[PDB]
Design a protein around this ligand. Structure first.
Ligand SMILES: CCCc1sc(-c2ccc(OC)c(O)c2)nc1CSc1nc(N)cc(N)n1
Ligand SMILES: CCCc1sc(-c2ccc(OC)c(O)c2)nc1CSc1nc(N)cc(N)n1
Ligand SMILES: O=c1ccn([C@@H]2O[C@H](COP(=O)(O)OP(=O)(O)O)[C@@H](O)[C@H]2O)c(=O)[nH]1
Ligand SMILES: O=c1ccn([C@@H]2O[C@H](COP(=O)(O)OP(=O)(O)O)[C@@H](O)[C@H]2O)c(=O)[nH]1
Lengths: 230, 228
């Protein structure tokens, strides 16, 4: 009964600006922020996260599997907690900052194709992912995906314009890898998956390349008309 | 369905005690250890590879091994709890357990500096969640402790003649060995699953070879099951 709607987009695309924008417009609207976002900083799950995330930066081939499995286990559990945590709400909609699907099909597929996950590591990640998400049935199944499309140069700007010292090192090409994978999975709609319904699951695209903090009303209008189709 | 775990050190006899035990009743079934099936499919092949990695670089693959194994155990005990549909007094014998994984090996890799604090507390955090969402009912109704000396096990690894095992050093079979005693005799260890503090335990000296001679061992097993 509580509508799940994931927001998808490249690093610094604006996901979390938009999500905290929407949160304020409807008591019928809540947010689930992504844990790694949470971890990207300066509870045991934080201690562990900034750690693994710091270790991920310094030597990604050593740390990729662990960190993926922990970004995703941390998300699955954070997702379920907002469901049990919009009870009374007449038209419940909850917004996920990214998804188990972006965990596996953009980020863990990137690192694998970019050689930080050898094949044993990837088939284990993907096995572990299948088994855990066939075991939720349709608890965490998405009614919708809003794609916060932008450009990698606007994301590098946004990164340095966000000032996370550790995020300053991520180069454009990497951003360009994650751009290529979003384009293909969402906008182009081609990337395959092991999940049935994510082929017949509706997708909103939105150009966030211009600052939207003061001028976001059209973006919001899009979001709503979109939620009435779903 | 009743649930027992058969625990004990490497080549101590579990697979034997179990291949024997399952034969004595149509009301009895076994879930053999994932790790031992690796010792072919995406489990096998994912299982076979990392095991072999884990012998070469243990400080690099214990998290990954320790996650995959617990998973595959959780998997297999669940597709098995499957068996014993038409039985009056049905028992499933688990060849090791989710606590074996954690409080024997995964603790022992950490203490051995083959996983770090992050890894080791990430595994802990995941074990605690992966057992509480999908694994509530893999809950044991007792435990069976096959107790060989650190010494007995090493010869029984030679017997089996597994190549990569014949590299298991004696000193390894030793700490694994004082950690079973602690959890399952002295009850010197304490875990994070409280019903486990009130699970009964039957412990069997298995230094004497029972490949022909298991009757009185089985007698206490039958006896222990009759006290649940
Ligand atoms: C933006 C902080 C998280 C990081 S750090 C990082 C990374 C850093 C340095 C690297 O090489 C120097 C690299 O190959 C990856 N990639 C990432 C993206 S991996 C990822 N991020 C998420 N937010 C979620 C998820 N499931 N996976
Ligand atoms: C029995 C084969 C699996 C291995 S391999 C291994 C090992 C091999 C070489 C090592 O040093 C190079 C080492 O420190 C450990 N320990 C083990 C035991 S760790 C373990 N065993 C299980 N049966 C289950 C589980 N979760 N963990
Ligand atoms: O219209 C916008 C959207 C975002 N940002 C900035 O872009 C950076 C990244 O935004 P956000 O934290 O949402 O990124 P994400 O959650 O996607 O990493 C932040 O410093 C924002 O202040 C901006 O200036 N204008
Ligand atoms: O009482 C025994 C128990 C075992 N074995 C042999 O020792 C080897 C290893 O034992 P097992 O695999 O059963 O031990 P586990 O690791 O399963 O506890 C096998 O070849 C058995 O045939 C034996 O000769 N006598």
């Amino acid at each position: 009964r509580i509508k799940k709607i994931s927001i998808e987009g490249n690093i610094a695309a604006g996901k979390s600006t938009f999500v905290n924008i929407l949160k304020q417009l409807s008591e019928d609207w809540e947010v689930v922020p992504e844990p790694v976002a949470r971890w990207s900083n300066v509870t045991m799950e934080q201690k562990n996260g900034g750690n693994v995330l710091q270790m991920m930066y310094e030597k990604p081939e050593r740390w990729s599997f662990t960190f993926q499995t922990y970004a995703c286990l941390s998300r699955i559990r954070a997702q379920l907690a907002s469901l049990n945590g919009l009870k009374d709400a007449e038209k419940p909609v909850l917004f996920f900052e990214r998804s188990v699907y972006s965990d596996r099909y953009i980020f863990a597929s990137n690192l694998y194709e970019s050689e930080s996950m050898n094949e044993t590591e990837w088939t284990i990640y993907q096995d572990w992912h299948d088994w855990m998400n066939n075991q939720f049935g349709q608890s965490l199944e998405l009614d919708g995906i809003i794609y916060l499309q932008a450009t990698p140069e606007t994301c590098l700007h946004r990164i340095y314009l966000r000032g996370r010292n550790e995020e300053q090192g991520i180069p454009l090409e990497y951003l360009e890898k994650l751009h290529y994978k979003h384009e293909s999975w969402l906008l182009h709609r081609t990337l395959k998956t092991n999940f049935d319904y994510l082929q017949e699951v509706p997708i909103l695209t939105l150009d966030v390349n211009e600052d939207f903090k003061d001028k976001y009303e059209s973006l919001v209008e899009k979001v709503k008309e979109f939620l009435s189709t779903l």
